[PDB]
RNA sequence: AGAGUGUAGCUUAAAAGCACCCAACUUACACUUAGGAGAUUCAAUUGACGCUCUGA
């Protein structure tokens, strides 16, 4: 009488751990619900996936969650906490390694 | 992560509560859910004092439930303004019910009616 | 600051959101008080101290 | 029955045409806004007097309940008791006058 | 402080032009109420 | 320690006559008037006080005033009782009708042998008599009138202890919902103090410190 | 008599930051917007004016 339920695992989770070198566009962490939020130099997909935006090193921090004011499912939560409470989520950053470019002499005009 | 010292840094639902008999249990004695009726024949003077007692419960930290009205009687309309109140101490049930009494503007009638 | 709130037409413009402040005059007073301490951030932010006085 | 009267009155739709002449003079808006300022200073102290008594009456009541406790420790268990006879409580607001003369006692009531 | 909550105005927008009518209930207890065609002294039997 | 078992009764009277406005309120009571008048729409009275007389000059191109001159003749008819039935008495401290816009506390003078001090009406209570009924035993021990008082609670207000044998005096509360002051010219000296006469008749720190819980307003 | 003392209501603030006032939208509250007032108790770390109590 129990049908269905045969779905395979979605293989979501951390692809690049902390300290791992990352190139631009490398998918950091595939997820279904927002478990790790995107930090510095990390973008989001439509399917909530985190991908690096610069070449650098993946770091996981705990940061203060301030949501967007136009997000009412998480602002009406924010206006319900007691007066000292502050939310925290874990964020994924990429501390970019290489600089953006160096000034090189091309000619002696 | 569970093995870590920062485990549960991000738990938040234990700071929200996401869901009456009088509380006189042994010594902690509080009133039940009161009703402060207010009545006059004016749309202003029935709402103006009932705006006051709400802001007085806000300043003096009393859990207000409701501020609704009763449907009028044809007798010229009767206006009723009912403020629900829970939470009174031993000490506070005097200082509330006097300054409430002593600040009624003009012929407006009071109540310490209750639930059901 | 008490005297300016004693002239009645001084707060005439203030409640019509239309009073003004002259920027030439604030400048030659700005460098009297905190114009030095504002230049300390600017010379710290522009990296002068970490390069020119080590 | 969840019936009330916070609806809009249905006869109030059509001929709203009395005073579009809503314009006010420039120095008159000074004193009007000078009064609404000086009333806004008025109610601040009109509140701060009441909030003074809401403490100053109060601290004695705890102090007396402390001065009831030490000398009479059986009996600060009944200063925290509650009265039942407040259930049809009432006080009418104050009036313009002591009520009346004897008589003349009339209205047609329709 | 029974002069506090009496300084007021009909806050509504769908409100008429009402006049400070004086009403006696039963025994000369006269109090102001906003009411039309100002009869300026009232009573009930 | 030996205490002389003596409570008291700070009675309150609710003033039934509302205080007249301050003129500082009255400029705003004049300003809250006109803003109520202008922001409205097409009232039923001026629909029949204006548009009739424009149609009546329209037939005159080819009544609500008798209403308006009759309804002023009921306000001039009914003689308003004054807020001021106080200056015609002006000494009548024995009457509950002495001050009408303010709240009143009873004060009966008595005499002791070792002291002689004006007092708030006392209560030599029994231990097995509760404290709350002791407040009810006070209205009905000396003045013997039928003042319809109701109460607040068994909380005290302020404990004052003049010792000689210790003391403790418990200042209670009551409200005059009504009062049948029979034999109003009693043998005693009951003085209805509004507020300012507490320093006129009660001198020390044990009776001019009652003031911190009387309704000032 | 004395002990403690004291920035506007609070400040392990040095003239501030919250509370607080009022008006407009709110059923009211709330939010927000427009506004509103506030203080170093005096005199050279210091001694005499105010409050709180210990006593009479
Ligand atoms: Mg499965
Ligand atoms: Mg499978």
UniProtKB/Swiss-Prot annotation, chain A:
The keyword Mitochondrion applies. One of its GO terms (cellular component) is mitochondrion. The chain holds residues 40 to 148 of 148 of the full protein. Keywords: Mitochondrion, Ribonucleoprotein, Ribosomal protein, Transit peptide. The keyword Thylakoid does not apply. Belongs to the bacterial ribosomal protein bL27 family. Its main location: mitochondrion. Component of the mitochondrial large ribosomal subunit (mt-LSU). Mature mammalian 55S mitochondrial ribosomes consist of a small (28S) and a large (39S) subunit. The 28S small subunit contains a 12S ribosomal RNA (12S mt-rRNA) and 30 different proteins. The 39S large subunit contains a 16S rRNA (16S mt-rRNA), a copy of mitochondrial valine transfer RNA (mt-tRNA(Val)), which plays an integral structural role, and 52 different proteins. This is Large ribosomal subunit protein bL27m. It is found in: Mitochondrion. GO terms for molecular function: RNA binding; structural constituent of ribosome. It comes from Homo sapiens (Human). GO terms for biological process: mitochondrial translation; translation. The lineage of its organism: Eukaryota, Metazoa, Chordata, Craniata, Vertebrata.
From Swiss-Prot, chain C:
Signal peptide: none annotated. It is found in: Mitochondrion. It comes from the Eukaryota. Residues 1-18 form a coiled coil. Belongs to the phosphatidylethanolamine-binding protein family. Mitochondrion-specific ribosomal protein mL38 subfamily. Component of the mitochondrial large ribosomal subunit (mt-LSU). Mature mammalian 55S mitochondrial ribosomes consist of a small (28S) and a large (39S) subunit. The 28S small subunit contains a 12S ribosomal RNA (12S mt-rRNA) and 30 different proteins. The 39S large subunit contains a 16S rRNA (16S mt-rRNA), a copy of mitochondrial valine transfer RNA (mt-tRNA(Val)), which plays an integral structural role, and 52 different proteins. mL38 is located at the central protuberance. This is Large ribosomal subunit protein mL38. It comes from Homo sapiens (Human). The lineage of its organism: Eukaryota, Metazoa, Chordata, Craniata, Vertebrata. The gene is MRPL38.
From Swiss-Prot, chain D:
It comes from the Eukaryota. One of its GO terms (cellular component) is mitochondrial inner membrane. One of its GO terms (molecular function) is RNA binding. Its main location: mitochondrion. GO terms for biological process: anatomical structure morphogenesis; mitochondrial translation. Keywords: Mitochondrion, Ribonucleoprotein, Ribosomal protein, Transit peptide. It is found in: Mitochondrion. Residues 86-110 are annotated as: Disordered. Ubiquitous. Belongs to the mitochondrion-specific ribosomal protein mL40 family. Component of the mitochondrial large ribosomal subunit (mt-LSU). Mature mammalian 55S mitochondrial ribosomes consist of a small (28S) and a large (39S) subunit. The 28S small subunit contains a 12S ribosomal RNA (12S mt-rRNA) and 30 different proteins. The 39S large subunit contains a 16S rRNA (16S mt-rRNA), a copy of mitochondrial valine transfer RNA (mt-tRNA(Val)), which plays an integral structural role, and 52 different proteins. mL40 binds to the major groove of the anticodon stem of mt-tRNA(Val) in the central protuberance. This is Large ribosomal subunit protein mL40. It comes from Homo sapiens (Human). The gene is MRPL40.
Curated annotation (Swiss-Prot), chain E:
It comes from Homo sapiens. Component of the mitochondrial large ribosomal subunit (mt-LSU). Mature mammalian 55S mitochondrial ribosomes consist of a small (28S) and a large (39S) subunit. The 28S small subunit contains a 12S ribosomal RNA (12S mt-rRNA) and 30 different proteins. The 39S large subunit contains a 16S rRNA (16S mt-rRNA), a copy of mitochondrial valine transfer RNA (mt-tRNA(Val)), which plays an integral structural role, and 52 different proteins. Keywords: Mitochondrion, Phosphoprotein, Ribonucleoprotein, Ribosomal protein, Transit peptide. GO terms for biological process: mitochondrial translation; translation. GO terms for cellular component: mitochondrial inner membrane; mitochondrial large ribosomal subunit; mitochondrion. This is Large ribosomal subunit protein mL55. Belongs to the mitochondrion-specific ribosomal protein mL55 family. It is found in: Mitochondrion. Coiled coil: none annotated. It comes from the Eukaryota. The gene is MRPL55. The chain holds residues 34 to 78 of 128 of the full protein. One of its GO terms (molecular function) is structural constituent of ribosome.
